[PDB]
PDB file of C-alpha atoms in Angstrom:
ATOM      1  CA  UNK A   5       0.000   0.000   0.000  1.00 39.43           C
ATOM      2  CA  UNK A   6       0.947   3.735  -0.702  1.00 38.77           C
ATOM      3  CA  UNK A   7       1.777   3.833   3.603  1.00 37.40           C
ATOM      4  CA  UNK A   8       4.427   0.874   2.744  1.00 36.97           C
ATOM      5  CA  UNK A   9       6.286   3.285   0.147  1.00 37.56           C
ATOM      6  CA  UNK A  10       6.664   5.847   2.510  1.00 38.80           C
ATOM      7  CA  UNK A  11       7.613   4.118   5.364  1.00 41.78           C
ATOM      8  CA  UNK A  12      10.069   2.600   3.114  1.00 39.38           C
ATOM      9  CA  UNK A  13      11.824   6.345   2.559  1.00 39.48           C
ATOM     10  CA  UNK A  14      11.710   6.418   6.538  1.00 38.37           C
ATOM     11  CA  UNK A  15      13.327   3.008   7.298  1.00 39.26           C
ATOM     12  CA  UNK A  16      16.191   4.085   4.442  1.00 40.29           C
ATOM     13  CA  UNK A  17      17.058   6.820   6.312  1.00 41.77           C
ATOM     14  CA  UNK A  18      19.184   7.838   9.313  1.00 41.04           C
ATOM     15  CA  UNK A  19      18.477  11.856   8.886  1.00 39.96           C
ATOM     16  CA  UNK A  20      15.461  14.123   8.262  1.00 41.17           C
ATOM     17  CA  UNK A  21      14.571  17.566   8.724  1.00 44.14           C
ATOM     18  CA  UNK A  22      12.279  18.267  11.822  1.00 42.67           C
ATOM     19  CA  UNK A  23       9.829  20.853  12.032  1.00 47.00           C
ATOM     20  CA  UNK A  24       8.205  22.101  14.862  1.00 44.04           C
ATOM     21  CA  UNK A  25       5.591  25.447  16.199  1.00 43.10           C
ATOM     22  CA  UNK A  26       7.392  28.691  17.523  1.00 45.25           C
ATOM     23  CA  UNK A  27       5.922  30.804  19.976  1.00 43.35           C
ATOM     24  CA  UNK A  28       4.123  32.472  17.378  1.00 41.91           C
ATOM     25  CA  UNK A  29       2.694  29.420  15.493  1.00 39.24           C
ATOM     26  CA  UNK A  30       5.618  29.492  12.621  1.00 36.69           C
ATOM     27  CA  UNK A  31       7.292  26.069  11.886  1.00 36.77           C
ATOM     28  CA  UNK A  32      11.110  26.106  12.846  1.00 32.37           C
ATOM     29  CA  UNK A  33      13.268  23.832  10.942  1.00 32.35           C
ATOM     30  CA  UNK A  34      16.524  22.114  12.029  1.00 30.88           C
ATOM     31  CA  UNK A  35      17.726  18.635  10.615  1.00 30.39           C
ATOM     32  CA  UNK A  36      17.893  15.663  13.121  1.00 31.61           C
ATOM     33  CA  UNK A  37      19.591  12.100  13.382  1.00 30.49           C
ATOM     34  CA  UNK A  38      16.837   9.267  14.416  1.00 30.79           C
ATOM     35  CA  UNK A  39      16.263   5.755  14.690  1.00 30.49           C
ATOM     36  CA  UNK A  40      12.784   4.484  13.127  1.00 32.11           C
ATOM     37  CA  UNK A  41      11.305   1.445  15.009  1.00 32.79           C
ATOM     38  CA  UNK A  42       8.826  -0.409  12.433  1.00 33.77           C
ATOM     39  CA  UNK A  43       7.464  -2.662  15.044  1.00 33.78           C
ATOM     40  CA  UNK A  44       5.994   0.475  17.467  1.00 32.28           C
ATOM     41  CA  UNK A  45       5.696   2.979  14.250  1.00 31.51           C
ATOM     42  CA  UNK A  46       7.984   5.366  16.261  1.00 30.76           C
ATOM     43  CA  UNK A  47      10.923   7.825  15.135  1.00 30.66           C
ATOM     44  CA  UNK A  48      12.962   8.500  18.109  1.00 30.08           C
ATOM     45  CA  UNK A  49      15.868  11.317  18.285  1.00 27.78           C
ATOM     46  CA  UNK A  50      18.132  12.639  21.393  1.00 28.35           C
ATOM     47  CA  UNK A  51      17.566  16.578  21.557  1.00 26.06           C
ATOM     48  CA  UNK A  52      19.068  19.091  24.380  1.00 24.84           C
ATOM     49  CA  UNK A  53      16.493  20.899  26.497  1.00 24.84           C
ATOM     50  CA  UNK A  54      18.117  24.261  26.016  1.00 21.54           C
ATOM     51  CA  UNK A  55      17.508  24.060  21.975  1.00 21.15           C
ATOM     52  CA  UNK A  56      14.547  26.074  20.430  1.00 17.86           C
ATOM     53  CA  UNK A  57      13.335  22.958  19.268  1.00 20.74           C
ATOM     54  CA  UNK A  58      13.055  21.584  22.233  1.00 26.46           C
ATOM     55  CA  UNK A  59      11.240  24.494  24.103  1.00 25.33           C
ATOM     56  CA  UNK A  60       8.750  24.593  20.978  1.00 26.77           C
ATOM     57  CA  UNK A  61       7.842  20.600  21.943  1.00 27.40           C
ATOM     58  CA  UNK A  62       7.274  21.081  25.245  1.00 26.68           C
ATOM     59  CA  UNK A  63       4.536  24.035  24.694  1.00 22.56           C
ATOM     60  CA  UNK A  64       3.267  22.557  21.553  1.00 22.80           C
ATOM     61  CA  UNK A  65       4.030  19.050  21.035  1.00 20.10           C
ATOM     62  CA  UNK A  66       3.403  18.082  17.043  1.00 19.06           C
ATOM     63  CA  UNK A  67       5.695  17.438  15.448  1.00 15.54           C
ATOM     64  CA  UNK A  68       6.535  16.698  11.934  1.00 15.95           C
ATOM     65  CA  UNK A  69       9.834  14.897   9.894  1.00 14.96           C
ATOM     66  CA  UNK A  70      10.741  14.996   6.054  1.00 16.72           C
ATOM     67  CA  UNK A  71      12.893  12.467   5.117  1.00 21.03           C
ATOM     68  CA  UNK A  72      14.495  12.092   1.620  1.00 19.78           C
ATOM     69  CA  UNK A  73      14.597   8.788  -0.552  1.00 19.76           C
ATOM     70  CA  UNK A  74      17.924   7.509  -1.667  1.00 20.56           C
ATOM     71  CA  UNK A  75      17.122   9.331  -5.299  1.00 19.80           C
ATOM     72  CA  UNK A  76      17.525  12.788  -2.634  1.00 22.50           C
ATOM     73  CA  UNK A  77      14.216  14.473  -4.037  1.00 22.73           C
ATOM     74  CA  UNK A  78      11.529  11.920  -3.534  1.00 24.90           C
ATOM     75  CA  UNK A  79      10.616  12.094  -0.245  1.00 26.84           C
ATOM     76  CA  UNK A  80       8.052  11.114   2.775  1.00 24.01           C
ATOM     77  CA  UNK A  81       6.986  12.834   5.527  1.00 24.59           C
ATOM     78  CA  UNK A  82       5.860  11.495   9.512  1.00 23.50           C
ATOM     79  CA  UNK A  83       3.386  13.785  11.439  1.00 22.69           C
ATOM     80  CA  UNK A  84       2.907  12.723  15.073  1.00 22.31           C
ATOM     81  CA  UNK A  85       2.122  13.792  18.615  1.00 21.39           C
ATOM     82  CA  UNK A  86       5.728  13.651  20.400  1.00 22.36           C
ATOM     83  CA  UNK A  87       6.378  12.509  23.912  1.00 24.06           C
ATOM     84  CA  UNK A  88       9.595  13.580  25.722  1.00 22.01           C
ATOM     85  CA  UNK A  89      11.306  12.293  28.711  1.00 22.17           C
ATOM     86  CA  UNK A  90      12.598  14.247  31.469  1.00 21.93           C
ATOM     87  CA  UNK A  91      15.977  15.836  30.386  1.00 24.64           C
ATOM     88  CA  UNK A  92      18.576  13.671  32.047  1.00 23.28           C
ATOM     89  CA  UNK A  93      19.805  14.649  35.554  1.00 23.85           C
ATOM     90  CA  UNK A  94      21.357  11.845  36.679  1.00 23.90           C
ATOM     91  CA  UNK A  95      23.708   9.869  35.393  1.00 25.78           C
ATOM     92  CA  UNK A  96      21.329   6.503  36.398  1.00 27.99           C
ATOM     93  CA  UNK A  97      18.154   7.599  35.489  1.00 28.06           C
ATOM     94  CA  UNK A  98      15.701   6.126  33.241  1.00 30.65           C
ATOM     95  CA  UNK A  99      16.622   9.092  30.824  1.00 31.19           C
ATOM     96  CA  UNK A 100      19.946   8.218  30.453  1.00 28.39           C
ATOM     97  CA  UNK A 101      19.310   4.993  30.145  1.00 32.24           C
ATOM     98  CA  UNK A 102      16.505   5.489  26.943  1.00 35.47           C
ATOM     99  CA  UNK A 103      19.803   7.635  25.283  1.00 32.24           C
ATOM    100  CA  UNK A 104      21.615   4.192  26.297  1.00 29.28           C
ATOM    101  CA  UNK A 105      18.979   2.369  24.382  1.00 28.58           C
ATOM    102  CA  UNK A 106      19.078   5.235  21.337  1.00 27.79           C
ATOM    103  CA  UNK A 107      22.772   5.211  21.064  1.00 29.08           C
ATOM    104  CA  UNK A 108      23.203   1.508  20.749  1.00 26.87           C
ATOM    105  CA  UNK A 109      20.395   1.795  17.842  1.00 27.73           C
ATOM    106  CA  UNK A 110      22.448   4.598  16.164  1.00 28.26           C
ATOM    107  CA  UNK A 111      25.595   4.632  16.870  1.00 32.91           C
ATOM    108  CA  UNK A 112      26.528   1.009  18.002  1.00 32.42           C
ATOM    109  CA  UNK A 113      28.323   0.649  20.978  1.00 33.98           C
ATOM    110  CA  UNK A 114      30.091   3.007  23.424  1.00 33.49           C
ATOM    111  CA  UNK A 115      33.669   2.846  24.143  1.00 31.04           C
ATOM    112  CA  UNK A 116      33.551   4.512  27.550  1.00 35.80           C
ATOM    113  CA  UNK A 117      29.312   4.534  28.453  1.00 34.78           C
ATOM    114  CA  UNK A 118      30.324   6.440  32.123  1.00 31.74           C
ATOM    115  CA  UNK A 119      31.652   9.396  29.704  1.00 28.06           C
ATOM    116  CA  UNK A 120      28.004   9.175  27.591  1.00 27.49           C
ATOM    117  CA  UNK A 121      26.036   9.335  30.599  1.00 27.45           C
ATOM    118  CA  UNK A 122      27.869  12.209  32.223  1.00 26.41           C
ATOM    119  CA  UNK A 123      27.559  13.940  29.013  1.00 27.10           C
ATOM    120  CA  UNK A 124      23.674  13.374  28.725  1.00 28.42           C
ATOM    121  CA  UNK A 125      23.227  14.872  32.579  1.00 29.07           C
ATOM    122  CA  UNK A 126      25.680  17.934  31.444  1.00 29.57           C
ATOM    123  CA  UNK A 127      24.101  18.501  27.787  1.00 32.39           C
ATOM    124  CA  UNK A 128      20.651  17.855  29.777  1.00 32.12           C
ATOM    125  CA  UNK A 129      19.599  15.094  27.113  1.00 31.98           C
ATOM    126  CA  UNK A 130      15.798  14.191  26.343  1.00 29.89           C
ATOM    127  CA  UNK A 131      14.895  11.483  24.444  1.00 32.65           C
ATOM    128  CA  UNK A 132      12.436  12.712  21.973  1.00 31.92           C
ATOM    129  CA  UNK A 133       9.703   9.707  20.831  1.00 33.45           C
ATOM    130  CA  UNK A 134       7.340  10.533  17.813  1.00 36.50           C
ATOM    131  CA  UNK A 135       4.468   7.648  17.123  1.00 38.61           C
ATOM    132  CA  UNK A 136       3.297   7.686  13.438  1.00 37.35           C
ATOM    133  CA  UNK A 137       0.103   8.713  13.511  1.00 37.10           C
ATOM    134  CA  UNK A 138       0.301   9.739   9.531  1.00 38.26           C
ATOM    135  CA  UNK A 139       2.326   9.743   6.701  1.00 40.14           C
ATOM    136  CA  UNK A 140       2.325  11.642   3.183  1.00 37.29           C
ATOM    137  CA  UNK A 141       4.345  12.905   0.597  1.00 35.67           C
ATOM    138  CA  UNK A 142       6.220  11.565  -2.696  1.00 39.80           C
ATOM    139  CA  UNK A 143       7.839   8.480  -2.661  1.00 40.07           C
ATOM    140  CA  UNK A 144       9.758   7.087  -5.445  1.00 40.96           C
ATOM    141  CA  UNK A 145       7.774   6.147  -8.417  1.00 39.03           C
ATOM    142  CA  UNK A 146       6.097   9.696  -8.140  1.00 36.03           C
ATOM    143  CA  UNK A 147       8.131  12.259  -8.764  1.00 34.92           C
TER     144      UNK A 147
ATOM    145  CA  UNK B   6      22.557  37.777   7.250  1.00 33.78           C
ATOM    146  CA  UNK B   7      25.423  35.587   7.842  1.00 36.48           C
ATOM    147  CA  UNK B   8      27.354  35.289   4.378  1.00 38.35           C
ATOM    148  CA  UNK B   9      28.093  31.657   5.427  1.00 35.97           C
ATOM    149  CA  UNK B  10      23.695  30.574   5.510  1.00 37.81           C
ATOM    150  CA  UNK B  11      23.520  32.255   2.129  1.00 36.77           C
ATOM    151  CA  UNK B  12      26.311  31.064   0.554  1.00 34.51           C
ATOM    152  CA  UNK B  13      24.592  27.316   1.258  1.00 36.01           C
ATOM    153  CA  UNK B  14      21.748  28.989  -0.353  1.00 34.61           C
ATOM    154  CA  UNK B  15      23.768  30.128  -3.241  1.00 34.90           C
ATOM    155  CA  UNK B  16      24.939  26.803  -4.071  1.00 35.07           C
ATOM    156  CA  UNK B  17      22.011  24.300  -3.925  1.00 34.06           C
ATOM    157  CA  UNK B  18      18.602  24.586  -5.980  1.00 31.19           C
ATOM    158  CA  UNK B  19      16.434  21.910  -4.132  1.00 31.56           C
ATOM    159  CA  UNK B  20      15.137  22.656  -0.112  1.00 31.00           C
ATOM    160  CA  UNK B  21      12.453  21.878   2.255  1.00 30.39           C
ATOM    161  CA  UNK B  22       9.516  24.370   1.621  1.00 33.96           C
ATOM    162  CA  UNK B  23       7.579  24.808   5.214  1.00 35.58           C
ATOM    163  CA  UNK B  24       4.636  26.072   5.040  1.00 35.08           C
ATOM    164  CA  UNK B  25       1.378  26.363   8.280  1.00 36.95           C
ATOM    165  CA  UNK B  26      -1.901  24.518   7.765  1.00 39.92           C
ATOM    166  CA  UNK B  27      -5.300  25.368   8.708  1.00 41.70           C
ATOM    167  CA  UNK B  28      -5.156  23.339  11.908  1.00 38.62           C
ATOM    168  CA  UNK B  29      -1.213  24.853  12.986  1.00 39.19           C
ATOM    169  CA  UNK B  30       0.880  22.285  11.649  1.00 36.00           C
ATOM    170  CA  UNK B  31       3.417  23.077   9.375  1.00 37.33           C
ATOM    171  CA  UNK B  32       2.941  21.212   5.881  1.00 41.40           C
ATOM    172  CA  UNK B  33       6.396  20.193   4.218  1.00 42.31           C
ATOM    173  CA  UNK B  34       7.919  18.903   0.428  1.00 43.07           C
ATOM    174  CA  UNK B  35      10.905  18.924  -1.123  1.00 43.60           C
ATOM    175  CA  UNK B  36      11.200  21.467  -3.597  1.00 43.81           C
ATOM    176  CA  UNK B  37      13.211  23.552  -6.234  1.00 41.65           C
ATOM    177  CA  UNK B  38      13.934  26.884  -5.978  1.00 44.89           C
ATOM    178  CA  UNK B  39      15.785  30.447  -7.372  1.00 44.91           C
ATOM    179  CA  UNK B  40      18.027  32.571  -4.758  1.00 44.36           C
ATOM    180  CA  UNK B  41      18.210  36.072  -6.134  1.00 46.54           C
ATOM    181  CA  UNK B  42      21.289  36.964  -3.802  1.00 48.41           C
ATOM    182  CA  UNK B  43      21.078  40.737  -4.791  1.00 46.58           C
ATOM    183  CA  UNK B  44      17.199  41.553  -3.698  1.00 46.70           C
ATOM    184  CA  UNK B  45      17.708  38.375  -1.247  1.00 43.68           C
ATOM    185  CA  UNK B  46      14.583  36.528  -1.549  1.00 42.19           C
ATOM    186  CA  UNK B  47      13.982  33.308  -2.489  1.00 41.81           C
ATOM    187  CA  UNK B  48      11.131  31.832  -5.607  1.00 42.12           C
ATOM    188  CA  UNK B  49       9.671  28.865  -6.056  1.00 44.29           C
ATOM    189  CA  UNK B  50       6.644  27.411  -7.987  1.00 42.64           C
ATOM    190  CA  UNK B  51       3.487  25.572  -6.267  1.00 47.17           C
ATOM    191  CA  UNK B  52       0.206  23.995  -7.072  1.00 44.89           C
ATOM    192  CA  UNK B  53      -2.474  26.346  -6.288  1.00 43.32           C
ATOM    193  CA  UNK B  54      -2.746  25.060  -2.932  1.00 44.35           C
ATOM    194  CA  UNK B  55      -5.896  22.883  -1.826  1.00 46.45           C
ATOM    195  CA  UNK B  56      -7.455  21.271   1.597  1.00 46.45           C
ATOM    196  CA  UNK B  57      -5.319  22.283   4.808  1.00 45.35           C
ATOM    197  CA  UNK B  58      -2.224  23.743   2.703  1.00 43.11           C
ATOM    198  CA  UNK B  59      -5.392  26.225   1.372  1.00 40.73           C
ATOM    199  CA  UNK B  60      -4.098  28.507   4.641  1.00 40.54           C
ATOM    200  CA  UNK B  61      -1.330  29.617   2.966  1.00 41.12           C
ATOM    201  CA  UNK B  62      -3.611  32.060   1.362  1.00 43.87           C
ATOM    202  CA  UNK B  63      -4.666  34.029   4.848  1.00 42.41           C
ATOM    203  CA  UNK B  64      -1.024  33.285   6.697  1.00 44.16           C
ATOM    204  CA  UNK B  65       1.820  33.259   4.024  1.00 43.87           C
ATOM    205  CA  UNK B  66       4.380  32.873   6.940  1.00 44.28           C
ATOM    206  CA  UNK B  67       7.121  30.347   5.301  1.00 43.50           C
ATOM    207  CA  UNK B  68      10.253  29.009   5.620  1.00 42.61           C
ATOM    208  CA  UNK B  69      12.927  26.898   3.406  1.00 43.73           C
ATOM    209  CA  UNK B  70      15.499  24.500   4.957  1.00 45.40           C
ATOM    210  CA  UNK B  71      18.489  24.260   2.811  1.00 44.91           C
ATOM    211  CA  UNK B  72      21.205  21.270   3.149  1.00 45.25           C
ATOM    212  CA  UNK B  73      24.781  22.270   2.660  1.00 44.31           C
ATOM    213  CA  UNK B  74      27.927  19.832   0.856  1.00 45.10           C
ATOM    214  CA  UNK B  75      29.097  18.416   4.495  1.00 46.21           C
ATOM    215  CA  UNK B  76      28.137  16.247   7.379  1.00 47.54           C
ATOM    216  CA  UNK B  77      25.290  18.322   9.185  1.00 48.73           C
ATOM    217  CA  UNK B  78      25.178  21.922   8.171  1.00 47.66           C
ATOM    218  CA  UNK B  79      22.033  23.857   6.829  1.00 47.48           C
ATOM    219  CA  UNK B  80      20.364  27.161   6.097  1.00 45.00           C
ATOM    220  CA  UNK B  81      17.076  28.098   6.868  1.00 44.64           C
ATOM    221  CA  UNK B  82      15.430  31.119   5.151  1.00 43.59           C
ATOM    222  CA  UNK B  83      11.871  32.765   6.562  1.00 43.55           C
ATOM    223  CA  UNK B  84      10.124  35.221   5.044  1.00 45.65           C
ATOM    224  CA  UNK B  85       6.400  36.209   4.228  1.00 47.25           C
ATOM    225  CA  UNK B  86       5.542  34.693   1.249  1.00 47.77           C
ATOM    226  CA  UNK B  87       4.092  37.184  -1.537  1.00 46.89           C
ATOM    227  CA  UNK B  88       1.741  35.070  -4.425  1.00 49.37           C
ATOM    228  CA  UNK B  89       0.739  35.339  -7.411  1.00 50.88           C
ATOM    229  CA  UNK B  90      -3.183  34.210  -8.459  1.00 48.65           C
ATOM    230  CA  UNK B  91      -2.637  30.673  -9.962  1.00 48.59           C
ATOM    231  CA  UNK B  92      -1.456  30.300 -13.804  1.00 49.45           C
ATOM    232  CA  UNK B  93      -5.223  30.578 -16.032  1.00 48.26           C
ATOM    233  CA  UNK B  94      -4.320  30.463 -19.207  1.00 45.95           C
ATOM    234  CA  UNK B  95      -1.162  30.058 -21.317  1.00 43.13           C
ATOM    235  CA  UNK B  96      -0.053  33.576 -21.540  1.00 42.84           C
ATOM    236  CA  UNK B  97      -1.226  34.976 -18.967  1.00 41.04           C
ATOM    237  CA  UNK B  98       0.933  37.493 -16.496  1.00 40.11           C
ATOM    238  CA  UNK B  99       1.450  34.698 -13.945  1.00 40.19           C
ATOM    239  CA  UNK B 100       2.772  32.022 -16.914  1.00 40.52           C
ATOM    240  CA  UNK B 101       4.734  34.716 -18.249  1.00 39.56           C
ATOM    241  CA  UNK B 102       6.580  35.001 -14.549  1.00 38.52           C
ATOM    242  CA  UNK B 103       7.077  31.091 -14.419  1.00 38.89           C
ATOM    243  CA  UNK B 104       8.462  31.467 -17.348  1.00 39.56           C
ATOM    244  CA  UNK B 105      11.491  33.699 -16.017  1.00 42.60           C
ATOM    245  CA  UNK B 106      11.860  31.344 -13.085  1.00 42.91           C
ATOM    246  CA  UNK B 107      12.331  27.997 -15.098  1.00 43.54           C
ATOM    247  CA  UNK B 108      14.795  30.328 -16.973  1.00 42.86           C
ATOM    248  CA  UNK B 109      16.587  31.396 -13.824  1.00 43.43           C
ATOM    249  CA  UNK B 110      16.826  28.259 -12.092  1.00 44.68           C
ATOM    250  CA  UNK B 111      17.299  25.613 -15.408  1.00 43.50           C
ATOM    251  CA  UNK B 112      18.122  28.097 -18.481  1.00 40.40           C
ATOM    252  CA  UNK B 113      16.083  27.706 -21.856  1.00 42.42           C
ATOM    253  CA  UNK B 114      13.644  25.287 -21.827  1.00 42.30           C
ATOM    254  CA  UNK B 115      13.269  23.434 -25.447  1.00 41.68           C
ATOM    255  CA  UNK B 116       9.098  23.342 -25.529  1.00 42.57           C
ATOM    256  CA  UNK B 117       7.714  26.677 -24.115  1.00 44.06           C
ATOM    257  CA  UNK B 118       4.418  25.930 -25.600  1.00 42.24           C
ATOM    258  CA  UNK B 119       4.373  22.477 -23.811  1.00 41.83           C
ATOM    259  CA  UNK B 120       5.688  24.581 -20.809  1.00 45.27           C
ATOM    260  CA  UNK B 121       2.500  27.300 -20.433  1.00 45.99           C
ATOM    261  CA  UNK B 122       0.042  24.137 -20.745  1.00 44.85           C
ATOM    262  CA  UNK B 123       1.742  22.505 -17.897  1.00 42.52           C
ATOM    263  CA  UNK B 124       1.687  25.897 -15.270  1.00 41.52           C
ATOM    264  CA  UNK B 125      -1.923  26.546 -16.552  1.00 44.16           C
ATOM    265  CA  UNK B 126      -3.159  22.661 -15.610  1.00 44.92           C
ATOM    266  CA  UNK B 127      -1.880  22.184 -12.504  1.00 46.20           C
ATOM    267  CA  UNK B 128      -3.135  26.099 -11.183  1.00 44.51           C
ATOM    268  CA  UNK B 129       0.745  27.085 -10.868  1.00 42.31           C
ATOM    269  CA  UNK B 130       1.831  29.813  -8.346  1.00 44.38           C
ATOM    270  CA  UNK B 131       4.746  31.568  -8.475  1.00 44.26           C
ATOM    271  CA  UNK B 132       5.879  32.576  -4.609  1.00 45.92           C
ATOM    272  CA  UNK B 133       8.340  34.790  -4.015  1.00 43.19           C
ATOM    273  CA  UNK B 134       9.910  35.003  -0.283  1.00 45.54           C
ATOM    274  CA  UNK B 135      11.756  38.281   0.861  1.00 45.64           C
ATOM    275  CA  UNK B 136      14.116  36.845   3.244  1.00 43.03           C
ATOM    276  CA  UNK B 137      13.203  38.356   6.850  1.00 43.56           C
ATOM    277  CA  UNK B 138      15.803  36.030   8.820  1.00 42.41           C
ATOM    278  CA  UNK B 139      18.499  33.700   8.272  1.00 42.90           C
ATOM    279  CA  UNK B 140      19.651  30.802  10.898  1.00 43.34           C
ATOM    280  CA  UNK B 141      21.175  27.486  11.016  1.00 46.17           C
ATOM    281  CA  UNK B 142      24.544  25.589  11.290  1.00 45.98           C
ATOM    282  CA  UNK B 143      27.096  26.866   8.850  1.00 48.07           C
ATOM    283  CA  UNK B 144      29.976  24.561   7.230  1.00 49.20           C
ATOM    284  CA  UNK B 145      33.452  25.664   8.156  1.00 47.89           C
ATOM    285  CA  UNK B 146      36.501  25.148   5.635  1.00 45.87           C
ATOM    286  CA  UNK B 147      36.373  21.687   3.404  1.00 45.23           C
TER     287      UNK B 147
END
């Protein structure tokens, strides 16, 4: 089905550009690394509380990620509802350990994992979750 | 503007075109676009827009997210956008400016004919965005 095509882009895809709702309802743009889980539906990225993006999703959660196809002009696009996590403030705490989670999904494994979770308390990490809820755009084949 | 953002504007053609829906949400494609670096705005050509993207016509409030040559770094441009009405018939003022555009952006197309039949069936607009502010991440020396 045409969802299939577009989830496709998604799962071929390590980067997108995020959008989310200033203050005064305009959509700010900034490009994001993420992990897509096809099992849940979810996009998940690690984002640091003091970033504009990050103040925009806590007063307005929606949320919205273009991702390009491997031709780099197709392209599909996820809108959900996100859900954040505490930003980390321990270097223990179920935060950090999410990022854990994320990193390994990402990145692979850590070389030194105290150093990671030290720098998620100091960069005050939040692990950013976005469920599907709908998909559009132009996936290969139509454009 | 920092010299650096438009320079990354400068040397691409293809961004993501953000634009706010009737509900808040901002509505997003990939599209092609001009850079006129002396009046510093930004055009690009769109569907007369239908459904939620139909906002655009009471809040023109946009935005375009250009990628730069290395790892991470990007532009974004924001502007109010100004519109023209939608392409109605093959020489009309608004096919006339689409026109210029494709010239701008591709050089000399080799059907003009086919061309004007193409902007007046799919209700083409021609929006032009005066660049208000400039952010983003800007590549260093590579």
């Amino acid at each position: 089905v045409f969802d299939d095509k577009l989830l496709a882009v998604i799962s071929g895809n390590s980067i997108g550009v995020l959008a989310t709702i200033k203050h005064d309802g305009r959509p700010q743009l900034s490009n994001v690394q993420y992990h897509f889980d096809p099992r849940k539906l979810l996009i998940q990225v690690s984002i640091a509380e003091p970033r504009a993006k990050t103040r925009n999703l806590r007063r307005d959660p929606r949320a919205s990620i273009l991702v390009d196809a491997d031709d780099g002009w197709s392209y599909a696009v996820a809108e959900g509802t996100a859900q954040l996590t505490p930003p980390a403030a321990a270097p223990d705490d179920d935060t950090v350990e999410a990022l854990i989670a994320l990193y390994r999904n990402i990145a692979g494994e850590h070389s030194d994992w105290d150093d990671y979770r030290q720098a998620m308390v100091t960069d005050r990490r939040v692990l950013l979750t976005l469920p599907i809820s709908h998909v559009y755009g132009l996936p290969p084949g139509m454009r």
